[PDB]
Amino acid sequence: IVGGYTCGANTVPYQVSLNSGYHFCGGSLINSQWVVSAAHCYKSGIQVRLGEDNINVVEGNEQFISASKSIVHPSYNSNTLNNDIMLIKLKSAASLNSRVASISLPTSCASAGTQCLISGWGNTKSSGTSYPDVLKCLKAPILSDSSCKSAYPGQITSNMFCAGYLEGGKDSCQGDSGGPVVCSGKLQGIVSWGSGCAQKNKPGVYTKVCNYVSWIKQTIASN
């Protein structure tokens, strides 16, 4: 997260860190057994880390649970990043508490102009590299479809939306991949892609979760 703020420990209790020997992506806990992340975060050997603030120190509220199965969306296209969504099943159910909590799925899509919360442990620099240990947060509005398509001609599908600031300075970044965009108490986006971070006229692009609720519900009903 570039240009954001320190969230405060466990104040984003649905935020998870995906670990394969190191943090490599975020995700969102949607019930005690399932995490939503980005398809581009797929790899084998994932451990889901819940209850995290400082990802380099065991502070006492963590739950570390290995994934039993990952399911990349059947239509994910890694060339266009269309359908950039993946479900991860936990080997055992998380213990839900005030610091480890699920985020509701949307029933309707969010509106342009709505302010959302984006969070993660990704790079905090727009030029260069600095990775934080504690969870960072950003308030960012959903941008109009027109401005999103103008920023990325030929590349925005109906399964994507832009959020952030066309003037730059504030954005998600590498390492935030797969993490949540929460608007009005619902998981409306997944950190997906962009062009650099916090650059002028290149806002973050996010998977439009409301288009995937039927697939999520069906998949968790049979796995």
Ligand X SMILES: Nc1ccc(CNC(=O)[C@@H]2CCCN2C(=O)[C@H](N)Cc2ccccc2)cn1
Point out the residues that are catalytic: 40, 84, 177
Site string for Ca ion, 30-69 (x = CB under 5 A): ----------------------x-x----x----------
Distances, alpha carbon 12 to alpha carbons 16, 29, 98, 179, in Å: 9, 10, 10, 11
55 half-sphere exposure, CB direction, 13 A CA radius: 26
Distances, alpha carbon 70 to alpha carbons 40, 66, 112, 133, 220, in Å: 12, 11, 31, 26, 11
Name residue 72's amino acid: V
**Least gap, CB of 165 to ligand X (angstroms):** 11
Nearer residue to ligand X within complex by CB, 55 or 197? 197
3-state DSSP assignment of residue 136: strand
**Least gap, CB of 28 to ligand X (angstroms):** 15
List of residues contacting ligand X (CB under 6 A): 40, 171-174, 176-177, 191, 193-195, 197, 204
Nearer residue to Ca ion within complex by CB, 121 or 206? 121
Nearer residue to Ca ion within complex by CB, 52 or 171? 52
User: What sections of the chain are H helices per DSSP?
Assistant: 145-151, 213-220
Which residues participate in the annotated binding site for substrate? Answer: 171-172, 174-175, 177
